[PDB]
Amino acid sequence: GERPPVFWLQGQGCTGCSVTLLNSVHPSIADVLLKVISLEFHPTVMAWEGEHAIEHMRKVAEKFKGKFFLVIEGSVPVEADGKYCIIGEANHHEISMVDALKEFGPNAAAVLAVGTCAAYGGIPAAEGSETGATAVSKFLGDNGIKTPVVNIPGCPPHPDWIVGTVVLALDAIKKNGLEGGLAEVVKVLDSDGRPTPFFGRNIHENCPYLDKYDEGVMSATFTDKVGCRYDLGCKGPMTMADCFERKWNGGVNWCVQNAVCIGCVEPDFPDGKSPFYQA
Amino acid sequence: GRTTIAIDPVTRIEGHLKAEVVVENGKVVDARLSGGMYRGFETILRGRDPRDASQIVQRICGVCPTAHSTASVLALDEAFGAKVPNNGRITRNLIFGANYLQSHILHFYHLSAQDFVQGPDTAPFVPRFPKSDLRLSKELNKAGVDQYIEALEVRRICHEMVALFGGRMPHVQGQVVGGATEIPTKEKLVEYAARFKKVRDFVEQKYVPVVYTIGSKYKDMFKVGQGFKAALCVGAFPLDNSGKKHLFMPGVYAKGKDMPFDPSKIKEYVKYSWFAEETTGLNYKEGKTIPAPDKAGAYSFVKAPRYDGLSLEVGPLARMWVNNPELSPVGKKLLKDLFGISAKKFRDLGEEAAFSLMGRHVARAEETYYMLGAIEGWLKEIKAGEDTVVMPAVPASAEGTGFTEAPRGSLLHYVKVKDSKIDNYQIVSASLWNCNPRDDMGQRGAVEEALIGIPVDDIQNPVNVARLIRAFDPXLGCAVH
Ligand code: SF4
Ligand code: SF4
Ligand code: SF4
Ligand code: FCO
Ligand SMILES: [Fe+2]
Ligand code: NI
Ligand SMILES: [S]
């Protein structure tokens, strides 16, 4: 069938949410781009550039009004009239991230806030920042934009969470149509806007080291892989993600095995999860 | 007439960049680069447990996070007086080295290659400039596309390599002050080596040959983009624990002369950057980051670093020029066969061809090949089962600096600790050296200068402007942080 158009806007992001997507195994990113979505705008990988790239996005947006998916990577900074994040220029006007989300957000089928920055504010919104870094849902709400938002957090998210959420939406839409399908997606989000298939389970209660935790057997050095990592800073108890099962990068490792969980999918990351290396 | 062309966003780079050039009689005669996004890691880091830095700083950039991880942990090692075990040093090199492979492959195929290669008739490979100057034959173009597709798999395998001892990627968990968090087992070393073999085959058989081969259809691109012809390398990849030998040795090259690198000669200017005027001209040990987004005359969030007053470039060309290694067997052969050039060491390309648009792509391919030997060496040197980390207490008062080479160029992190918390943290990154604006005396940044002379014979299709910029593999997330 016809692949839905996607525009991928980067605000105060690090491109790590884009890179993590490139690591998708099944399906491969090649299959995602050629068979699953039509990625019409993405500043890191698209052919065209500048005002022409912006105008192409605008033409597609008009043609597919209400039907395109808008991915946001990074937070949206509201201070200084949006000047901490300029994303383009067209018609001799600078376009801030603020301007862009106000332009495209109202006409999207849905906004996918990919990564903790976009979902919750993340590192750019953390203590010591001064750009007014704002999460997607808060920004849209503050601006009266009612478009459905799905949060796919993590710093970065696992590619399976991103692709899987797109597929959840596509399955629901095939069965129910666009509005109806997106309503079915919203019903499987938790109170933080996250899809329960990927974020409905707790790391700690499913952790292979739980028996050691219960026995009070704690590693005193990172390279001791027998003990529980709690004293080293592990935030598994406060974290809702399925990393314990799918693991990372083709299943070769994950944070708790290698070091500690830093709770990167949680709304209070990083400050509520810091210091990282103490309980 | 004088034509002003503004390109915002410059695509197929990392991060937010606007380029504005003036074209007169078919050539660029002036240029300004604007990094348009700021987060302010240097202020966000203040007040934190210093051990947190080696996680926080990675979020500067999800393409090069291992470089920031490395610089941070080196700075923290120095500040904490942590003595990283020999096996931990080698493990860190395996983690970081694998991302060099990922980053260079990503850059040439997924960022740069569409400059020369027409992709399939579907987004995001169309639409594009009506006259894109795509010169390859049907066969060679298809090889480009097939290798772009193969390279998507290969770069992903590079990140599996990173994650084996790094935990996950982007944003590794496995490097901390004191070493590496996971001792390599015999089993996981077999897994690393099996993946490494595939990446090596791709680099040797596809990547290096295709850069020379495409280069040979764009020989005019070796005659432009020289800029200042001045380069910086701060050293990277310690090869012993004495700290005396590195895979890339430090040095500076300018006006045809080689000289040692002295970090005390770095100063960061801000006249044309959106920061408070009173913070101009500071060495990183006394660096300050005070944003001034409304400041008259400024046009970028990138500060302007100068080395003893010089505007320098960094990256694979800089490192390969400074270190002047032997060229790959592939390179020697194709330089002869396709270019009629006889060359043994990198500098045998000559200054003009090396410091050129296509020269910088060649340098990056050659460096990728060079890194293969380094990683192979580390896989022989590493000892399965030997401890990789120490667990040092946090100091109340300390400072430290970590120097390394990110895939895009020279990187340093400086930390000052007071009352057991980060008092100051300053970052001077690779793309900061390349993509910066004018300094206080009006001297352009390296890429700005390299744009001068670039041909624009068709102002409606000014493709060579971004082609030059992409040769430097710009990363504006790093440049601004
Ligand atoms: S969520 Fe993390 S990985 Fe994604 S853009 Fe933000 S800092 Fe980068
Ligand atoms: S290692 Fe972390 S997630 Fe696992 S049992 Fe211990 S505290 Fe819980
Ligand atoms: S284990 Fe914890 S830190 Fe690692 S990806 Fe999962 S939620 Fe994030
Ligand atoms: N490579 C990389 Fe990132 C940049 N520029 C750093 O340092
Ligand atoms: Fe800095
Ligand atoms: Ni970077
Ligand atoms: S990196």
Q: What is the DSSP string of B11-61?
A: PSSBS-EEEEEEEETTEEEEEEEEE-B---HHHHTTTS-GGGHHHHGGGG-
Helix (H) or strand (E) holding B246: strand B246-248
Q: Look at ligand 7, atom 1, and give the residue with the nearest C-alpha.
A: B64
CA distance A187 to chain B (A): 30
**B134-158 exposure pattern, b = at least 16 Cβ within 10 A, e = fewer:** bebeeebbebbbebbbebbebbbbb
* Number of neighbours of residue B7 by Cβ within 10 angstroms: 22
Q: Are residues A219 and A194 in the same domain?
A: no
Contact B18, A54 (CB under 8 A): no
Contact B111, B473 (CB under 8 A): yes
A117 as an active site residue: the answer is yes
Q: Are residues A264 and A186 in the same domain?
A: no
Instruction: Tell which of A156, A179, A198 closes a domain.
Output: A198
Residues in chain B with CB shorter than 8 Å from the CB of A88 are: 8-9
Alpha carbons A205 and A238: distance in angstroms, whole number: 10
Ligand with smallest separation from the Cα of B313:
4
DSSP state of B306: E
Look at strands A133-134 and A68-73 and give their pairing: unpaired
B345 touches chain A (CB under 8 A): no
Domain spanning B1-481: which CATH class is it, in words? mainly alpha
Residues in chain A with CB shorter than 8 Å from the CB of B294 are: 80, 83
Alpha carbons B10 and B435: distance in angstroms, whole number: 12
Q: Which residue of B has its CA nearest to A41?
A: B124
Closest CA to B304 of B28, B27, B26, B34: B34
Structure tokens at A16: 């790590």
DSSP state of B3: E
Beta strands in B260-350 (DSSP E): 266-269, 304-307
- The verdict on a CB contact (< 8 Å) between A28 and B60 is no
Residues in chain B with CB shorter than 8 Å from the CB of A98 are: none
Best of A201, A202, A203, A204 for a ligand 2 pocket test (most atoms within 8 Å of beta carbon): A204
- The verdict on a CB contact (< 8 Å) between A221 and B466 is no
Contact B52, A275 (CB under 8 A): yes
B215 touches chain A (CB under 8 A): no
Cα of B170 vs centre of ligand 7, distance in Å, is 10
Q: Which residue of B has its CA nearest to A26?
A: B153
Q: Are residues A71 and A99 in the same domain?
A: yes
Residue whose pair of structure tokens reads 């629901």 in the numeric block? A172
Collapsing DSSP to helix, strand or coil, B425 comes out as: strand
Alpha carbons B13 and B469: distance in angstroms, whole number: 9
Residue A199: partners with Cβ closer than 8 Å, 6 or more residues away:
A153, A161, A190, A192, A240, A241, A242, A265
Measured from the Cα of A154, ligand 3's closest atom is 8
Alpha carbons B357 and B374: distance in angstroms, whole number: 27
Alpha carbons B462 and A52: distance in angstroms, whole number: 12
A243 as an active site residue: the answer is yes
Query: Which residues contact ligand 1 via a Cβ below 6 A?
Result: A 13-14, 16-17, 73-74, 115-117, 122-123, 155-156; B 59, 62, 170
φ, ψ dihedrals at A45, nearest 5°: -125, -10
Closest CA to B18 of B430, B469, B443: B469
Structure tokens at A75: 């937070």
Contact B82, B76 (CB under 8 A): yes
Alpha carbons B419 and B396: distance in angstroms, whole number: 5
Contact A140, A149 (CB under 8 A): yes
Look at strands B17-24 and B27-35 and give their pairing: antiparallel
- Contacts made by residues B274-277, CB under 8 angstroms, sequence distance 24+: B274/B38, B274/B298, B274/B300, B274/B301, B275/B303
Q: Are residues A210 and A163 in the same domain?
A: no
User: Residue B246 corresponds to which amino acid?
Assistant: H
Best A58, A87, A127, A253 member to test B by mutation, with max B CBs in 10 Å, is A253
Alpha-carbon torsion A103, A105, A107, A108, what sign?
positive
- The verdict on a CB contact (< 8 Å) between A259 and B9 is no
**B347-370 exposure pattern, b = at least 16 Cβ within 10 A, e = fewer:** bbbeeebbbbbbbbbbbbbbbbbb
Closest CA to B20 of A200, A94, A59, A133: A94
Cα of A200 vs centre of ligand 3, distance in Å, is 14
Question: Is A55 annotated as ligand-binding?
Answer: no
Cα of B72 vs centre of ligand 5, distance in Å, is 13
Residue B442: partners with Cβ closer than 8 Å, 6 or more residues away:
none
Contact B411, B57 (CB under 8 A): no
Q: Which residue of A has its CA nearest to B35?
A: A86
Instruction: Provide the edge-to-edge strand list for the sheet that holds B409-418.
Output: B398-406, B409-418, B421-428
- The verdict on a CB contact (< 8 Å) between B171 and A156 is yes
Structure tokens at B426: 């300053």
Helix (H) or strand (E) holding B409: strand B409-418
DSSP state of B175: E
Closest CA to A276 of A231, A241, A243: A231
Q: Which residue of A has its CA nearest to B64?
A: A16
Looking at the partner chain, which of A28, A30, A47 has a beta carbon nearest the beta carbon of B126? Answer: A47
Structure tokens at A3: 């692949």
Residue B452: partners with Cβ closer than 8 Å, 6 or more residues away:
B28, B29, B30, B31, B227, B444
Q: Which residue of B has its CA nearest to A91?
A: B6
Measured from the Cα of A207, ligand 2's closest atom is 4
Query: Which residues contact ligand 7 via a Cβ below 6 A?
Result: B 64, 66-67, 99, 103, 406-407
Alpha carbons A217 and A67: distance in angstroms, whole number: 53
The domain of A93 spans 1-198
The length of chain A in residues reads: 279
Report cis status (omega within 30 of 0) of the bond before B392: no
Contact B112, B207 (CB under 8 A): no
Contact A79, A16 (CB under 8 A): no
Cα of A232 vs centre of ligand 2, distance in Å, is 10
Collapsing DSSP to helix, strand or coil, B263 comes out as: helix
Q: Are residues A106 and A218 in the same domain?
A: no
DSSP-assigned beta bridge partners for residue B179: B176, B389
Q: Are residues A164 and A67 in the same domain?
A: yes
DSSP state of B420: T
Torsion of CA B358, B364, B370, B371, to 10 degrees: -170
A92 as an active site residue: the answer is no
Best A51, A81, A252 member to test B by mutation, with max B CBs in 10 Å, is A252
Ligand with smallest separation from the Cα of B291:
5
Alpha-carbon torsion B467, B436, B158, B318, what sign?
positive
Longest dimension (CA), chain B: 69
Q: Are residues A165 and A276 in the same domain?
A: no
Alpha carbons B341 and B348: distance in angstroms, whole number: 9
Please state the three-class secondary structure of chain A as a single string: CCCCEEEEEECECCCHHHHHHHCCCCCCHHHHHHHHCEEEECCCCCCCCHHHHHHHHHHHHHHCCCCEEEEEECEEECHHHHCCEEEEEECCEEEEHHHHHHHHHHHEEEEEEEHHHHHHCCHHHCCCCCCCEECHHHHHHHCCCCCCEEEECCCCCCHHHHHHHHHHHHHHHHHHCHHHHHHHHHCCECCCCCEHHHHCCECHHHCCCHHHHHHCCECCCCCCCCCECHHHCCCHHHCECCHHHHCECCCCECHHHHCCCCCCCCCCCCHHHCCCCCC
What is the number of CB-based contacts under 8 A between chain A and chain B? 263
**Any alpha helices (H) in B316-445, and if so which ranges?**
316-323, 329-339, 351-354, 357-381, 430-434
- The verdict on a CB contact (< 8 Å) between A253 and B14 is no
Looking at the partner chain, which of A50, A53, A255 has a beta carbon nearest the beta carbon of B168? Answer: A255
Look at strands A5-10 and A68-73 and give their pairing: parallel
Q: Are residues A226 and A159 in the same domain?
A: no
Alpha carbons B98 and B368: distance in angstroms, whole number: 10
- The verdict on a CB contact (< 8 Å) between A275 and B52 is yes
The catalytic residue among A42, A85, A155, A158 is A155
Residue whose pair of structure tokens reads 């990592």 in the numeric block? A229
Q: Are residues A254 and A118 in the same domain?
A: no
Question: Which CA distances in Å does A260 have to A83, A227, A243, A270, B431?
Answer: 36, 12, 12, 14, 31
B52 touches chain A (CB under 8 A): yes
Looking at the partner chain, which of A46, A248, A262 has a beta carbon nearest the beta carbon of B11? Answer: A46
CATH number for the domain harbouring residue A179: 3.40.50.700
- CA geometry: angle at B231 spanning B226 and B237, to 5°? 135
DSSP state of B310: B
CA distance B148 to chain A (A): 10
Collapsing DSSP to helix, strand or coil, B419 comes out as: coil
Structure tokens at A206: 């499913």
B164 touches chain A (CB under 8 A): yes
Question: Which CA distances in Å does B120 have to B33, B150, B464?
Answer: 31, 15, 22
Best A32, A49, A131 member to test B by mutation, with max B CBs in 10 Å, is A49
Q: Are residues A80 and A183 in the same domain?
A: yes
Closest CA to A17 of A59, A96, A89, A72: A72
Report the Cα A89 to chain-centroid distance in Å. 25
Best A8, A35, A48 member to test B by mutation, with max B CBs in 10 Å, is A48
**Residues 105 through 124 of chain B touching chain A, CB cutoff 8 Å:** 106, 110-111, 114, 119-120, 122-124
Q: Which residue of B has its CA nearest to A57?
A: B127
Structure tokens at A126: 């953390």
- Domains of chain A: total: 2
User: Residue B77 corresponds to which amino acid?
Assistant: D
Residue B79: partners with Cβ closer than 8 Å, 6 or more residues away:
B50, B395, B398, B399, B400, B415, B417
- The verdict on a CB contact (< 8 Å) between B38 and A85 is yes
Instruction: Tell which of A181, A198, A215 closes a domain.
Output: A198
Question: Which CA distances in Å does B209 have to B134, B144, B147, B332, B334?
Answer: 19, 11, 11, 11, 7
Question: Which CA distances in Å does B110 have to A226, A239, B14, B302, B441?
Answer: 41, 34, 11, 25, 37
Alpha carbons B324 and B39: distance in angstroms, whole number: 37
Q: Are residues A184 and A277 in the same domain?
A: no
A17 as an active site residue: the answer is yes
Look at strands B236-238 and B246-248 and give their pairing: antiparallel
Residue B297: partners with Cβ closer than 8 Å, 6 or more residues away:
B271, B272
Burial label, B413 (beta-carbon count in 10 A; 0-12, 13-18, 19+): buried
Measured from the Cα of A210, ligand 2's closest atom is 5
Contact A200, A241 (CB under 8 A): no
Alpha carbons B94 and B189: distance in angstroms, whole number: 10
Instruction: Tell which of A198, A222, A246 closes a domain.
Output: A198
Query: Which residues contact ligand 4 via a Cβ below 6 A?
Result: B 61, 64, 67, 406-408, 411, 429-431, 475, 478
Report cis status (omega within 30 of 0) of the bond before B9: yes
Q: Are residues A150 and A79 in the same domain?
A: yes
Contact B328, B242 (CB under 8 A): no
